[PDB]
């Protein structure tokens, strides 16, 4: 059930550890888990070289709970493409945590780097601290991005959250910087704090809700008025929101930005 990884001193040259996920840990003894391959720069190494490993094995990934009992700020790709189980990180992570995720749950108790939940398909990611750029984003050049799952960031995020989103749900309880929902096609973004600029830049569909203040917005949106008591993607939101449709710089755009009335009179 519970498998404990205690990090050793983290290296300046970061680690890539896609193989830290329940799917790989399943059916392995503690000794075999120590011998799992991870990368350390341009060198292939063993997970045991940077982590103490304890706990009890299990045969199915559903029953496996990985907890990283320490800061791993310089390890990338943890939980990448995991289908089931749970990961708990008692500290910070680097980039790509849960990238390509299909199922299960990851909880990061500190900060996360960029591309957290990139190309997410299913499952849940929850980050108790701050996140970087490109939460739930796509990959370079691809027009098909995140299609399912839920990402919850309790702190702040930076740029291009939900880039090319095509499904799923992202919730930022804090503030974001610029261009949340850039090129969005489908899905739901809820920003409970503030937005600096360009919410919904070049979106074609989907829904963005901003409960705080947007300092700037975009002239390609048509203002539709005010809506109360909004139901979107199974979430009920109280209060009134200014309603915008765009981004009409894009042909056939049907995206929706909702902005809370209390702090967005200058946007109307």
């Amino acid at each position: 059930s519970e498998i404990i990884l205690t990090p050793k001193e983290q290296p300046e040259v970061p680690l890539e550890a896609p193989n830290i996920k329940p799917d790989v840990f399943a059916g392995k003894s503690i000794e075999e888990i120590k011998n799992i391959q991870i990368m350390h720069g341009n060198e292939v190494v063993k997970l045991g070289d940077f982590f103490e490993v304890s706990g009890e094995p299990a045969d199915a990934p559903e029953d496996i709970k990985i907890i990283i009992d320490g800061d791993v700020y310089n390890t990338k790709r943890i939980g990448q493409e995991m289908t089931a189980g749970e990961i708990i990180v008692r500290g910070n992570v680097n980039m790509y945590v849960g990238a390509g995720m299909k199922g299960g749950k990851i909880t990061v108790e500190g900060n996360a780097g960029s591309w957290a939940g990139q190309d997410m398909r299913g499952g849940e990611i929850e980050i108790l601290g701050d996140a970087g750029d490109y939460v739930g984003s796509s990959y370079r050049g691809d027009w098909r991005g995140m299609s399912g799952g839920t990402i919850t960031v309790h702190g702040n995020a930076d740029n291009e959250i939900g880039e090319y989103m095509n499904g799923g749900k992202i919730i930022i309880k804090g503030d974001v910087n610029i261009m949340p929902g850039i090129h969005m096609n489908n899905g739901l973004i809820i920003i409970e704090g503030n937005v600096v600029a360009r919410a919904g830049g070049e979106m074609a569909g989907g829904t963005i809700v901003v409960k705080g203040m947007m300092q700037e917005f975009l002239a390609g949106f048509k203002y539709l008025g005010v809506e109360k008591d909004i139901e979107v993607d199974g979430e009920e939101l109280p209060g009134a929101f200014y309603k915008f449709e765009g981004d009409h710089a894009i042909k056939g755009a049907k995206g929706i930005v909702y902005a809370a009335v209390g702090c967005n009179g200058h946007i109307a």
Binding site: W115, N159, N177
Partner: protein, 129 residues
């Protein structure tokens, strides 16, 4: 004074880099800050006077110069180079490209001297290996 710092090219700094960045020419062309004459008056400085530029990310001393390419109100121009790059915003926003242009800085007159090219680099404190 709070101002907007913009950076980029000038033929004089282009001539200078292909002449030699070890040359005096390069300090004269790149260790400068271009200002509207009205801004120089408000700050109480003349061409040739030195300016201390401070930002969230660093600080530098540059020679004040009258902009012959007029600037918007509140903006200054430092040509690309290590002086400008003491103060501009390093973060790339996960693009790999820093924010070299349009950075809030504080400028104030100073009698300190402009650092020449090898002296400027010493602040980064290169350790041999």
């Amino acid at each position: 004074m709070r101002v907007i710092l913009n950076t980029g090219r000038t033929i004089w700094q282009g001539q200078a880099i292909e002449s030699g960045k070890d040359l005096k020419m390069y300090v004269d062309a790149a260790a400068i800050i271009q200002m509207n004459p009205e801004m120089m008056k408000q700050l109480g400085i003349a061409e040739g006077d030195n300016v201390k530029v401070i930002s969230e990310y660093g600080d530098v001393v540059v020679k004040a110069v009258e902009a012959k390419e007029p600037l918007p109100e509140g903006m200054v121009y430092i040509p690309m180079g290590p002086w400008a790059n003491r103060v501009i915003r390093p973060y790339t926003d996960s693009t790999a490209t820093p924010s070299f242009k349009n950075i809030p800085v504080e400028i104030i007159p100073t009698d300190e001297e402009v650092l020449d090219m090898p002296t400027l680099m010493k602040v980064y404190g290169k350790v041999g290996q």
